[PDB]
Amino acid sequence: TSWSDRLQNAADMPANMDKHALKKYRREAYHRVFVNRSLAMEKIKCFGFDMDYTLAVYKSPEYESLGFELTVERLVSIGYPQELLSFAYDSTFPTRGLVFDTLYGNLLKVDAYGNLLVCAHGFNFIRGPETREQYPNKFIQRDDTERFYILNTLFNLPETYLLACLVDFFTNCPRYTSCETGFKDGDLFMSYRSMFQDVRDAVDWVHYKGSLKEKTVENLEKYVVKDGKLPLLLSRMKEVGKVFLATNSDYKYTDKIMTYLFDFPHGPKPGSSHRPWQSYFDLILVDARKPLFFGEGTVLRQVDTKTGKLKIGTYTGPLQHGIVYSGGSSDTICDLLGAKGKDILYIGDHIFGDILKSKKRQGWRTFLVIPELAQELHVWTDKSSLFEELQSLDIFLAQRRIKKVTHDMDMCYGMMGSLFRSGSRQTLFASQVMRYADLYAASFINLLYYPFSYLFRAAHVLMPHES
Amino acid sequence: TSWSDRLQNAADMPANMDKHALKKYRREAYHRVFVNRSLAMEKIKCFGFDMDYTLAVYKSPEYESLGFELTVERLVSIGYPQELLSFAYDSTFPTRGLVFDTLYGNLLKVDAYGNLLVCAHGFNFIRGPETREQYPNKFIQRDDTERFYILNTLFNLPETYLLACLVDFFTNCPRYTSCETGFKDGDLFMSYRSMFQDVRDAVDWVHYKGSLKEKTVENLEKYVVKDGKLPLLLSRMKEVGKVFLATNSDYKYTDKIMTYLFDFPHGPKPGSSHRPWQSYFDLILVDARKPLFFGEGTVLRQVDTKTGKLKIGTYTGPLQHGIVYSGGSSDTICDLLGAKGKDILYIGDHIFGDILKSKKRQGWRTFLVIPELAQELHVWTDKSSLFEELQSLDIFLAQRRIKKVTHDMDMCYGMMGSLFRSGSRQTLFASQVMRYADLYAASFINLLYYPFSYLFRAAHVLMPHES
Ligand SMILES: [Mg+2]
Ligand SMILES: [Mg+2]
């Protein structure tokens, strides 16, 4: 099964708010909130939510497969070869947080320090010695954003795989000659960089100018996890604080998704009257443009909720009941809900644009949703054997077996391994989760299972000379 | 006593290279190398050294007091008031790694996340509630380099204290009216920012156009720690690898300092012939301009070692015996010593310009010298009681006593507390040591006490969900 299967299984369950049931439930990994830094919930005055891959978790592999399919069609449409059409999305290939090197056309799994853990060129996994040809120090300068692109979001799962399909196809298609930095077809040269830009633009185009959204919304059961405990959680938050939505997506789409998310015969709990999704929020903001939202932002606009268009002009009014904002900045939230950054818990899946940025620019408290965790956890438990074997093989040498066992652990997760590590080496992703997510979970719903008085605790950190 | 007292005490001792003596010596905190990330020394092919506050550790408080005294004289010289002349350097005030806020004229001790641990305005320590006036979220955006300056080096110890003297003097001098962002004297307005720039320029001027260097070199016993084990360590490194000097300072100064550093009746060991400092290095480079050195660098020049001037032109030749370089880049070192970044251990005291930058830009291995550690360690041991009391007071509540005990621990270190923490809260400095220094010690000489085969080990890191 998939991580969205695990999530949706848990979603289909009623909430048993009996306090002993709660305590028991959240000691189970699947339902636990994990803590990187201590957070006293009683201090949180505003709970803020992201929408895509946070409140609205898209079913896998269905959604990735749709995105891939329409990206490929867009590319064939602009003149890429018909062979593309025979590609089919494969969920066992891509892991999130990979770096596409646009110079050399490789996918890299790196650690926090730019060190190379895995290198695939198409579907060929390049081993240690061979990577030194292009990476003399087995290292990339990942801030070199012109050359290196980090495929940080679940939205990038289909393109991670498509990049590899395309490198593989051109490499092995006799019409094209492979060169260091791209492919020659007679008098046309396609660099990996230009190829990469096309894929990137086509993904954007599918989400913005194409048919992805329309196809999602016309079959919401197929594409979006739904959970009757969402209204319960939000109603409970609203009892102790303020709740807000801040989404990069536009009004029309947010309304269709959010309406689905709340589409039950009842309100917070079974038996209670249904109420519109907007009622659960003290402030609703779309077209956020995160991460820029956490700095200068853009001009504050007001949505005409009847037409779905923006009113003409900058909005200069106060928080009214029923107003929906567009644009603005993180200061809009603070000022209008009368909060300081440390009074806000923002909940989101984008490690960069939701968590890193809110934490560094603004000192918000952060909760990261990691939808893959719901399944990464089952693997970590079931194959704790291998990791233990590896753990123990590092102490006995304190070599070829370290390498063989690493590969066997990593393969259980997929061709590109755990989101969090390659053997004993932690990924950039893992290290940024630890660095900037105060709390993290497989789902935001795991907060339901903790009283609002709860103190999420982490042990104090000590330097080597201090221990 | 001072940290340089501790260092010089250890320096005055001969090396007992008996292997059992070695093992014993380095288990003592003062002589230990501390490990943030595992490092196999057998992999290191080049050992690179910084000079100022690394090889050449300046005696405290003598050196800071000299710098302060000449900075103050420079300022009076350009028209600051004669009262400045009655200031005298006080070593118990400043801690390294403070942030001067140029808007409000405060010194801040912050954590990795910009959270405020201490705020002093002149010598007035502003408590929790009062800091919310200027810092509504008790937080600064430390990347806002136009507003916030981090006083990261031992060279900045005198200016940290001078900033506070000056804020205190203008505040309490009846000629000046204190405003939010600076001081009014009739028709002249002095912002904290313009004041700060003057101090900063005057420090630069003292080091570059003034008399600090001349006064150092005319009394090297007073101002610079010297240790007969330096040549031993370097000779031993040269047996297993290549040794290089890369200093921001110029040739003439480097030669006077380095000659002092090696001024013993003997060479590597007692009884052996003395040899010139340059003989210990496979590559010597001055005017490095770190951190830019770790990127594009500057043009490679060759020093005329007879005149102390640079030859005219870019140097296009190979590594020759006896050549001294100026400028260039980190690639100069790699290319000319035929090394890759992970074959280099660079040793230095500048957390930013030596360690952070070499690690992020180039993947060098890093050893940070923390000269204050030689004394920070004695306090941590002797007052382990207080920290233990605090440690234990955090678990019993798992408040006013947490706060009172924090202050008593921090005061043992100075008015601005440990370099590494304020109570249980770790400083930005501490967190960057952990993040970018693979190894660290109170002195580079602590490497002497470890065989070159040694494996510096750190335990593998696990995420909360993995433990
Ligand atoms: Mg999202
Ligand atoms: Mg230095």
Swiss-Prot record, chains A, B:
Q: What is this protein called?
A: Cytosolic purine 5'-nucleotidase
- Where, in this chain's numbering, is adenosine 1 bound? 152, 432
What does the UniProt function comment say about this protein?
A: Broad specificity cytosolic 5'-nucleotidase that catalyzes the dephosphorylation of 6-hydroxypurine nucleoside 5'-monophosphates. In addition, possesses a phosphotransferase activity by which it can transfer a phosphate from a donor nucleoside monophosphate to an acceptor nucleoside, preferably inosine, deoxyinosine and guanosine. Has the highest activities for IMP and GMP followed by dIMP, dGMP and XMP. Could also catalyze the transfer of phosphates from pyrimidine monophosphates but with lower efficiency.
Q: Which cofactor does it need?
A: Mg(2+)
Q: What is the lineage of its organism?
A: Eukaryota, Metazoa, Chordata, Craniata, Vertebrata
Indicate whether Cytoplasm appears among the record's keywords: yes
Gene Ontology biological-process annotations: adenosine metabolic process; allantoin metabolic process; amide catabolic process; dGMP catabolic process; dGMP metabolic process; GMP catabolic process to guanine; GMP metabolic process; IMP catabolic process
Tell me the residue numbers annotated for binding (2R)-2,3-bisphosphoglycerate: 142, 360, 436
Gene assigned in the entry: NT5C2
Q: Which residues form the active site?
A: 50 (nucleophile), 52 (proton donor)
Binding positions for Mg(2+) per the UniProt entry: 50, 52, 349
Summarizing the annotation, the consequence of altering residue 439 to P is: In SPG45; uncertain significance
Q: Which disease is it linked to?
A: Spastic paraplegia 45, autosomal recessive: A form of spastic paraplegia, a neurodegenerative disorder characterized by a slow, gradual, progressive weakness and spasticity of the lower limbs. Rate of progression and the severity of symptoms are quite variable. Initial symptoms may include difficulty with balance, weakness and stiffness in the legs, muscle spasms, and dragging the toes when walking. In some forms of the disorder, bladder symptoms (such as incontinence) may appear, or the weakness and stiffness may spread to other parts of the body.
The source organism is: Homo sapiens
Gene3D superfamilies the UniProt entry points to: HAD superfamily/HAD-like
Question: Where, in this chain's numbering, is P(1),P(4)-bis(5'-adenosyl) tetraphosphate bound?
Answer: 152, 360, 432, 436
Compartments, record wording: Cytoplasm, Cytosol
Q: Which family does it belong to?
A: Belongs to the 5'(3')-deoxyribonucleotidase family.
Which UniProt keywords are given for this protein, alphabetically ordered? Allosteric enzyme, ATP-binding, Cytoplasm, Disease variant, Hereditary spastic paraplegia, Hydrolase, Magnesium, Metal-binding, Neurodegeneration, Nucleotide metabolism, Nucleotide-binding, Phosphoprotein, Transferase
Q: Which residues bind GMP?
A: 50, 52, 200, 204, 213, 247-248, 290
Subunit record text: Homotetramer.
Tissue distribution is: Widely expressed.
Q: Write down the EC number.
A: 3.1.3.5, 3.1.3.99, 2.7.1.77
Specify one Pfam family.
Answer: 5_nucleotid
**GO terms of molecular function:** 5'-nucleotidase activity; ATP binding; GMP 5'-nucleotidase activity; identical protein binding; IMP 5'-nucleotidase activity; metal ion binding; nucleoside phosphotransferase activity; ubiquitin protein ligase activity
